Amino acid sequence: PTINQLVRKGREKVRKKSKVPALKGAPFRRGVCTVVRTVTPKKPNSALRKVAKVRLTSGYEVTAYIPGEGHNLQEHSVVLIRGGRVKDLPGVRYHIVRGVYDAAGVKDRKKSRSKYGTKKPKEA
Amino acid sequence: MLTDPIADMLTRIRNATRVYKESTDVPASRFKEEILRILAREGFIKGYERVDVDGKPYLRVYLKYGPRRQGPDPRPEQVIHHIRRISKPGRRVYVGVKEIPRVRRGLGIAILSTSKGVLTDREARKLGVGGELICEVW
Amino acid sequence: PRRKRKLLLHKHELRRLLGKVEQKGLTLVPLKIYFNERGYAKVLLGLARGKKAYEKRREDKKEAVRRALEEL
RNA sequence: AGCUAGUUGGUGGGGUAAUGGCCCACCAAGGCGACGACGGGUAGCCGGUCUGAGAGGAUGGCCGGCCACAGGGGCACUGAGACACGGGCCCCACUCCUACGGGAGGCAGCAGUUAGGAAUCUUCCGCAAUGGGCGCAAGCCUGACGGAGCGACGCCGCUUGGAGGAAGAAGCCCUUCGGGGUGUAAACUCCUGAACCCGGGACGAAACCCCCGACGAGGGGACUGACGGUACCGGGGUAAUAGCGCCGGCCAACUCCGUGCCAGCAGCCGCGGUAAUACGGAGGGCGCGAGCGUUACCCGGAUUCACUGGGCGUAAAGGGCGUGUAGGCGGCCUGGGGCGUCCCAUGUGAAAGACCACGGCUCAACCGUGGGGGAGCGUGGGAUACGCUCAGGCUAGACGGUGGGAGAGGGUGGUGGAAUUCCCGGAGUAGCGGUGAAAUGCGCAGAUACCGGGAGGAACGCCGAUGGCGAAGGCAGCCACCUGGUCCACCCGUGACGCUGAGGCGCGAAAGCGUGGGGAGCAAACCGGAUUAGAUACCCGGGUAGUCCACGCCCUAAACGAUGCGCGCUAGGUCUCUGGGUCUCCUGGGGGCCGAAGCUAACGCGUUAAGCGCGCCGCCUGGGGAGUACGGCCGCAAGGC
RNA sequence: UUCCCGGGCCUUGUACACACCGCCCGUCACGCCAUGGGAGCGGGCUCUACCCGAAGUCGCCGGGAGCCUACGGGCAGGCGCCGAGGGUAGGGCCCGUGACUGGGAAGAAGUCGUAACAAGGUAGCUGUACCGGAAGGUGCGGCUGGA
RNA sequence: AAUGU
C-alpha cells in the first residue's frame, strides 16, 4: 500500500489466540475430575489414552492427559492441571501434573522422574 | 502529466544505460541540471548538454560505461549500477546533518538538496547542512 | 487393566487348542464376553485366520543420504 | 454513526485563593462528529523495564515522580493546607457489647488470621544511625526507618577436595569369547584444611548538650550501638553434599534386554506391528551444577501487518464499470513571504537506571564519585535548494476551434425476406416420426411428403473475421429521426484549468419479481417411453413458467485479460482495422501473433508490460468453519451488501 | 487389425504417485465436541420519569416560643432548594441458561449410490431458477481454468 | 458398464 494509505488505515497489529485458557494465564490450575476416561487416538496411532474430564476452579470443564504408566485417579479426584496438548487426542489440551494431590507419582519409575512425580528412589 | 519530474529523469538514466545507449534526453529543468551537474562532477556521466527538440528545451545525458568484457555476454559493466530516488512527492524525506546517509560505505554518493544548494553527502556533510535527501547513486 | 488373565478349559479341550496353536499360525481371539446362567464371567474364544500382514511404507531419503555421508 | 439542553455562547449574579456553565436566573440557538464524536471493552500514567541489528514490539513489579482511593456512598467542619487512612455527621452492609433504650468499629499502616488461589514472609530487635513531630533545652513519640527472621525467588561469590596412582582390581555393562568400557575413577600413598573449638573484636558516632569565648566564628570536655561478641583478625583443625535435564532429526550425546500400534512418548516431523539409537530399565555419553527441568506470559526468530522491509495473471489478494465529494498527489521560468525543511546559540531533558572512567566492601553482585550522551519541546538569530503560500510570466499536460473519418455505441418510429407452427383450400395414400436399437406419440376420423392462401410470434442467413463499437454489462436485416463516444489533420484559441478518487450517485449478462400485454419456436417443473440394478439423469415423444414488449423492481457472475486508472522511459519483426503524408516510404490511433533488454517460483509477460519509475484508490496476511451466524442497511420476494 | 487380452515408441489430459484394484462426493445410522435459533426463564451494568428522602451547605424566618448581648445582631429552632439511599415503572448493551431444532468438525472395515479428477465415461466450473433419497440433474446466460 | 478395509 501507498504511504498515504498506511497513514489512513495503518497496519493490523497481530494478536494471537491462547493455545490454553487455563484462565488468568496462571501457570497451572487445580480442578476436580468428573470423568476419568480412556480414549482412542487419531488415525495413524492406536491405544487407550488415559485422559480425565476435569472441572477447574476457573469454571472450565476441560479434558486432560494423564502421563506415566498407571494412575490412581477416581471419578471425582482433586487434580492440578498443567498445560500441553496431545497431537493425537482431539480436544485434549492440558496435561495433569503427576505427583500433586490425588494424582500419584509413577511407581517403579526411575528415569525422567522430575517430570513424572516420583521421588528419588533410595538405592536400597 | 508526469507526477515526479526528478524520479522520471533518474529513471531515464537507468533505462537508458540499461541498454548501453550513448545518450538520452530529459525535459529541461534548472533543478535537474544541478543534479546532473553533480552526476558529472563525480563522473557518473561523461557530462550533459542543454539542447532542443522542436523548440522544447532538453538536457542530453551522455552515459558512461566500463570496458567491453571477455566471455559470453561481453556487455560492459555500468558506472551507474544503482540510481534510486529517496524522497518522493508522496513521502518527502529530510535528514539533519547528523542523520545524512552513508552510501555504500563511501563508494557511493547521496545527492541531496539543502538551503545551501544541491550538494553530495560529503559536500553537504563538510558544509554543516542537511536537507531533502534526493536520491542515492552507486 | 491389561493383565494376563487366565482361562478355564477342559484338559482335552486345552490340548486340542495347543495342537493347533503351536503347529500353525492361527490365533485365539476374544470373540465376546458375558455371564452364563450361574452368573459367571464367561469368555467366548475364536479360531483365527491370522495372516493380515501390516504394510509398512519405507526408506526416507533423509536416512539414505545420512548413512552414505557417515559410512563413507 | 450520529451525540448534546446547563447542552454552546451571552449579560448580571452566586461561589473560591483564583479563571471558568463550577452553580443560578435571563437572552440567543448554539457545541461536537469519519482528522472517529457518543457508546462499549480494557487500563492507574511516566522515569524506566524486558526484547530487538535497528526502526519497532511488549511492559509499568521493586526504587523515584504525579494521580486516585481508605468497607460501599454522600457531606461538610476545623484549619496555611483536608472536604481528612488509624478526625466528625448521615444512610447501607457486616461483626461485636447491652440491664434491649443505645453504644463501640473498619489493617489497601507493621506484624498476624481466615477466605480465595498455582502462589507470596516474623504477632521480632532498635530508635544507635538517617528522616519527621513537639520543645529553649534536656527530652518524648516515630511498626518512617536502620536491622535480624523465614523462602535456592532472583543475581554474584564459595565448597564437596589437591599431587600421585594398573595392559586396567571387584561389581556392573557390552563382546566377532580374544576382549572392550566405567577408570586414574577407586582402593592406596602422601597433601591442604569447608566446617567446627579456642582467644582478640569493629567502622557505622559525633552531634545536639556542657565549658571558655557574646549561645557567632573557633577551641576543650562528656554520653550514647539495635544489628553483635556478628563481619573480620590470630591459633588449632576432620576430606568433609550432587543433583537434574537430555542422548531418532532440529541438537551436543549409543548399546543390551523388556514390551510386540500393548504399555507408552510427543514441541514439530513423528516413534511403538517380535533384533525399537524415539516406549520402560540398565550400561554408557552429552549438557549444566545447588541447581536442573516443566508450565504460563512478553520480545526474538517472523521481511508472518513489511517505515526500515512484503505483496495482489495462475499461490491469499483488483472493487462489475463508470461519474465524482472529501482527501492525497502536481509541468516550465521569475520574484516576495520563509510555514515545512535545514543550521548555530540557549533554556528544559530532576534523581535512580543504561554507557564509560576511577575507587569502597578480600572478588563480584551490589555501592560511591566524576564524565558524556538525549530525542523531543520553548526562545533567539540565520539559510532558501526542495515542499507550501502570495504574484508576475510560459505552453511541452489538459481542454477548446476549423476540417475530415470509421463504427453491430445508445434511444424512437417504421418495414423486408427466408424459416417454424397453426388455420383454410387443392391434390394425394400407408405410413410418419424417432434412436445406438426401440418405444411412447402422430396417422386410414386421411397423417408424412407436395402446391397456393391466410394468421401470428421471434430471430435476422450470405456479408462476417483473426473484424468493428462501447466505461462495463454489452451491441448484428434495412430505412428515417433524436443522441453519446472516439480518431486524424492544420497547430488556430485558453493557459496547468491536471491525476486519482474513502463516501455519494448512476449504469449493470442471464435467471428471478410486480402490474398489463404477447405467446410462433424453445423449454426448467411436470407426464410419458426407453436405458438401467435403480434412473427422480444422459436419449426420444409431449409440456407450463419463462424466453418477447411496456413501465417498476432485483444488483448478482469464470461481471475474466482471473491483470485498477493516469503519465513518462526501455530493440525489433509480422498480420490487421482506421486516418494523414513531399502516399518506393514515413507517421497517428486500435486490435492480434513472435520476440531486445529486463521481469518471473515457473508457466509465461514483454511499447496493448506481468519491464524500469511516480501519483491515487481497492484488496490480501495459512486450510476449513464461511461469504456462515449475530447485528445493521437494502429488497415484494427470492436474496444482496 | 475396427473389437477382446498383453506390450512397444512419441504425443496429451490428470485433483493419481503402494500410481485406476488410484483418487473421491453428499444424505442416512451411531457416538462425541463447539456453535446458531429457541416458548422463555436467571443475572450484571447503564439510562430515563416519578414517589419517600438521612447528613449537610446554602436560602428564607427566627414569630402567639426559649437562650446570649456591647439590643446592630447571634445561637437554638421552623421552613425550603439540592441530596446518598430506597421504592415503582419502562427502555438499552452484555452474560448464563432452555424442551426442541439448524447447520459444522472429528470418530472406525457402518448403509446408499458414484458427482468430481483421464471426453471420469453426458467437458467442467459458474450466477440464477426449479426439481429430486443423496451426491446432483435440468433451463437461461457466462467463462476456458475444455475441445 | 458401478464399486475396491
Short mmCIF file of N, CA and C (backbone and C1' of nucleotides) in Angstrom, two decimals, chain D residues 460-490:
data_model
loop_
_atom_site.label_atom_id
_atom_site.label_comp_id
_atom_site.label_asym_id
_atom_site.label_seq_id
_atom_site.Cartn_x
_atom_site.Cartn_y
_atom_site.Cartn_z
P C D 460 -31.06 -11.60 -33.44
"O5'" C D 460 -30.69 -12.31 -34.82
"C5'" C D 460 -30.07 -11.60 -35.90
"C4'" C D 460 -30.32 -12.32 -37.22
"C3'" C D 460 -29.73 -11.65 -38.45
"O3'" C D 460 -29.18 -12.60 -39.35
"C1'" C D 460 -32.10 -11.72 -38.64
P G D 461 -27.60 -12.70 -39.52
"O5'" G D 461 -27.41 -13.89 -40.56
"C5'" G D 461 -27.56 -15.25 -40.15
"C4'" G D 461 -27.64 -16.15 -41.35
"C3'" G D 461 -26.51 -16.00 -42.35
"O3'" G D 461 -25.34 -16.68 -41.96
"C1'" G D 461 -28.60 -16.06 -43.48
P C D 462 -23.95 -15.89 -41.91
"O5'" C D 462 -23.65 -15.60 -43.45
"C5'" C D 462 -23.38 -16.68 -44.35
"C4'" C D 462 -23.42 -16.20 -45.78
"C3'" C D 462 -22.49 -15.06 -46.14
"O3'" C D 462 -21.20 -15.54 -46.50
"C1'" C D 462 -24.67 -14.67 -47.00
P C D 463 -19.89 -15.08 -45.68
"O5'" C D 463 -19.92 -13.50 -45.85
"C5'" C D 463 -19.71 -12.90 -47.14
"C4'" C D 463 -19.94 -11.42 -47.06
"C3'" C D 463 -19.20 -10.75 -45.92
"O3'" C D 463 -17.88 -10.36 -46.26
"C1'" C D 463 -21.51 -10.17 -45.87
P G D 464 -16.83 -10.01 -45.10
"O5'" G D 464 -17.07 -11.17 -44.04
"C5'" G D 464 -16.06 -11.54 -43.08
"C4'" G D 464 -16.71 -12.30 -41.94
"C3'" G D 464 -17.55 -13.49 -42.38
"O3'" G D 464 -17.52 -14.56 -41.44
"C1'" G D 464 -18.92 -11.91 -41.29
P A D 465 -16.53 -15.80 -41.66
"O5'" A D 465 -15.15 -15.25 -41.12
"C5'" A D 465 -15.01 -14.94 -39.75
"C4'" A D 465 -13.61 -14.48 -39.46
"C3'" A D 465 -13.40 -14.29 -37.97
"O3'" A D 465 -12.21 -14.85 -37.46
"C1'" A D 465 -13.21 -12.19 -39.08
P U D 466 -12.25 -15.58 -36.03
"O5'" U D 466 -11.43 -14.59 -35.07
"C5'" U D 466 -10.16 -14.97 -34.49
"C4'" U D 466 -9.13 -13.87 -34.73
"C3'" U D 466 -9.71 -12.55 -35.24
"O3'" U D 466 -9.17 -11.38 -34.63
"C1'" U D 466 -8.08 -13.36 -36.75
P G D 467 -10.16 -10.18 -34.19
"O5'" G D 467 -10.76 -9.60 -35.54
"C5'" G D 467 -9.94 -8.85 -36.44
"C4'" G D 467 -10.77 -7.83 -37.20
"C3'" G D 467 -11.40 -6.71 -36.40
"O3'" G D 467 -10.53 -5.67 -36.00
"C1'" G D 467 -13.02 -7.63 -37.86
P G D 468 -10.88 -4.80 -34.68
"O5'" G D 468 -12.23 -4.06 -35.07
"C5'" G D 468 -12.31 -3.23 -36.22
"C4'" G D 468 -13.62 -2.49 -36.23
"C3'" G D 468 -13.93 -1.73 -34.96
"O3'" G D 468 -13.30 -0.49 -34.85
"C1'" G D 468 -15.80 -3.03 -35.56
P C D 469 -13.10 0.15 -33.40
"O5'" C D 469 -14.58 0.29 -32.84
"C5'" C D 469 -15.46 1.28 -33.38
"C4'" C D 469 -16.73 1.39 -32.57
"C3'" C D 469 -16.55 1.60 -31.08
"O3'" C D 469 -16.20 2.91 -30.69
"C1'" C D 469 -18.14 -0.10 -31.43
P G D 470 -15.21 3.10 -29.45
"O5'" G D 470 -16.14 2.83 -28.19
"C5'" G D 470 -17.30 3.63 -27.96
"C4'" G D 470 -18.15 3.03 -26.88
"C3'" G D 470 -17.46 2.78 -25.55
"O3'" G D 470 -17.30 3.95 -24.77
"C1'" G D 470 -18.72 0.87 -26.18
P A D 471 -15.86 4.31 -24.15
"O5'" A D 471 -15.78 3.40 -22.85
"C5'" A D 471 -14.61 3.40 -22.04
"C4'" A D 471 -14.86 2.66 -20.76
"C3'" A D 471 -15.52 1.30 -20.93
"O3'" A D 471 -14.62 0.26 -21.29
"C1'" A D 471 -16.68 2.55 -19.30
P A D 472 -15.14 -0.98 -22.17
"O5'" A D 472 -16.06 -1.79 -21.15
"C5'" A D 472 -15.46 -2.46 -20.05
"C4'" A D 472 -16.49 -2.88 -19.04
"C3'" A D 472 -17.58 -3.82 -19.51
"O3'" A D 472 -17.14 -5.17 -19.65
"C1'" A D 472 -18.52 -2.08 -18.21
P G D 473 -17.81 -6.10 -20.79
"O5'" G D 473 -19.29 -6.33 -20.26
"C5'" G D 473 -19.53 -6.85 -18.94
"C4'" G D 473 -20.98 -6.70 -18.56
"C3'" G D 473 -22.00 -7.24 -19.56
"O3'" G D 473 -22.22 -8.63 -19.45
"C1'" G D 473 -22.63 -5.07 -18.86
P G D 474 -22.15 -9.56 -20.77
"O5'" G D 474 -22.64 -8.63 -21.95
"C5'" G D 474 -24.03 -8.33 -22.11
"C4'" G D 474 -24.21 -7.04 -22.89
"C3'" G D 474 -24.42 -7.16 -24.39
"O3'" G D 474 -25.75 -7.50 -24.70
"C1'" G D 474 -22.86 -5.44 -23.94
P C D 475 -26.09 -8.15 -26.13
"O5'" C D 475 -25.81 -6.98 -27.19
"C5'" C D 475 -26.61 -5.77 -27.21
"C4'" C D 475 -26.16 -4.85 -28.32
"C3'" C D 475 -26.12 -5.46 -29.71
"O3'" C D 475 -27.35 -5.48 -30.40
"C1'" C D 475 -24.08 -4.35 -29.27
P A D 476 -27.82 -6.83 -31.14
"O5'" A D 476 -27.17 -6.74 -32.59
"C5'" A D 476 -27.54 -5.72 -33.53
"C4'" A D 476 -27.19 -6.13 -34.95
"C3'" A D 476 -27.93 -7.33 -35.54
"O3'" A D 476 -28.30 -7.09 -36.89
"C1'" A D 476 -25.63 -7.62 -35.80
P G D 477 -29.80 -6.69 -37.26
"O5'" G D 477 -29.73 -6.45 -38.83
"C5'" G D 477 -28.92 -7.32 -39.66
"C4'" G D 477 -29.45 -7.33 -41.07
"C3'" G D 477 -29.66 -5.95 -41.66
"O3'" G D 477 -28.48 -5.39 -42.25
"C1'" G D 477 -31.65 -7.24 -41.89
P C D 478 -28.14 -3.82 -42.06
"O5'" C D 478 -29.31 -3.10 -42.86
"C5'" C D 478 -29.55 -3.40 -44.24
"C4'" C D 478 -30.83 -2.74 -44.70
"C3'" C D 478 -30.98 -1.29 -44.30
"O3'" C D 478 -30.24 -0.39 -45.08
"C1'" C D 478 -32.99 -2.47 -43.84
P C D 479 -29.74 0.99 -44.44
"O5'" C D 479 -31.07 1.86 -44.38
"C5'" C D 479 -31.83 2.09 -45.57
"C4'" C D 479 -33.10 2.83 -45.25
"C3'" C D 479 -32.92 4.06 -44.39
"O3'" C D 479 -32.43 5.20 -45.05
"C1'" C D 479 -34.72 2.78 -43.56
P A D 480 -31.46 6.21 -44.26
"O5'" A D 480 -32.47 7.15 -43.45
"C5'" A D 480 -33.49 7.87 -44.13
"C4'" A D 480 -34.47 8.44 -43.14
"C3'" A D 480 -33.85 9.16 -41.95
"O3'" A D 480 -33.42 10.49 -42.23
"C1'" A D 480 -35.51 7.63 -41.22
P C D 481 -32.32 11.19 -41.29
"O5'" C D 481 -33.09 11.50 -39.94
"C5'" C D 481 -34.29 12.28 -39.94
"C4'" C D 481 -34.95 12.24 -38.59
"C3'" C D 481 -34.03 12.62 -37.44
"O3'" C D 481 -33.86 14.01 -37.30
"C1'" C D 481 -35.22 10.64 -36.90
P C D 482 -32.47 14.57 -36.73
"O5'" C D 482 -32.52 14.18 -35.18
"C5'" C D 482 -33.58 14.70 -34.35
"C4'" C D 482 -33.47 14.15 -32.95
"C3'" C D 482 -32.10 14.24 -32.29
"O3'" C D 482 -31.78 15.48 -31.71
"C1'" C D 482 -33.01 12.08 -31.99
P U D 483 -30.25 15.89 -31.52
"O5'" U D 483 -29.57 14.64 -30.79
"C5'" U D 483 -29.63 14.51 -29.35
"C4'" U D 483 -28.75 13.36 -28.86
"C3'" U D 483 -27.27 13.37 -29.17
"O3'" U D 483 -26.46 14.22 -28.39
"C1'" U D 483 -28.13 11.19 -29.48
P G D 484 -24.90 14.35 -28.75
"O5'" G D 484 -24.22 13.15 -27.97
"C5'" G D 484 -24.33 13.04 -26.55
"C4'" G D 484 -23.63 11.79 -26.06
"C3'" G D 484 -22.15 11.68 -26.35
"O3'" G D 484 -21.33 12.46 -25.50
"C1'" G D 484 -23.21 9.64 -26.87
P G D 485 -19.98 13.10 -26.08
"O5'" G D 485 -19.01 11.85 -26.27
"C5'" G D 485 -18.74 11.01 -25.15
"C4'" G D 485 -18.08 9.74 -25.59
"C3'" G D 485 -16.72 9.90 -26.25
"O3'" G D 485 -15.68 10.09 -25.31
"C1'" G D 485 -18.05 8.42 -27.51
P U D 486 -14.39 10.96 -25.71
"O5'" U D 486 -13.74 10.12 -26.91
"C5'" U D 486 -13.30 8.76 -26.72
"C4'" U D 486 -12.89 8.14 -28.03
"C3'" U D 486 -11.85 8.91 -28.84
"O3'" U D 486 -10.51 8.71 -28.44
"C1'" U D 486 -13.66 8.32 -30.24
P C D 487 -9.39 9.80 -28.85
"O5'" C D 487 -9.14 9.51 -30.39
"C5'" C D 487 -8.60 8.25 -30.82
"C4'" C D 487 -8.38 8.23 -32.32
"C3'" C D 487 -7.59 9.37 -32.93
"O3'" C D 487 -6.18 9.30 -32.79
"C1'" C D 487 -9.53 9.01 -34.20
P C D 488 -5.33 10.65 -32.69
"O5'" C D 488 -5.21 11.12 -34.21
"C5'" C D 488 -4.69 10.23 -35.20
"C4'" C D 488 -4.95 10.78 -36.58
"C3'" C D 488 -4.40 12.17 -36.86
"O3'" C D 488 -3.03 12.17 -37.21
"C1'" C D 488 -6.65 12.05 -37.57
P A D 489 -2.11 13.41 -36.80
"O5'" A D 489 -2.52 14.56 -37.82
"C5'" A D 489 -2.44 14.32 -39.22
"C4'" A D 489 -3.20 15.36 -40.00
"C3'" A D 489 -2.80 16.82 -39.82
"O3'" A D 489 -1.61 17.19 -40.50
"C1'" A D 489 -5.16 16.62 -39.75
P C D 490 -0.51 18.08 -39.73
"O5'" C D 490 -1.12 19.55 -39.79
"C5'" C D 490 -1.36 20.19 -41.05
"C4'" C D 490 -2.16 21.46 -40.87
"C3'" C D 490 -1.62 22.45 -39.85
"O3'" C D 490 -0.54 23.23 -40.36
"C1'" C D 490 -3.97 22.19 -39.58
#
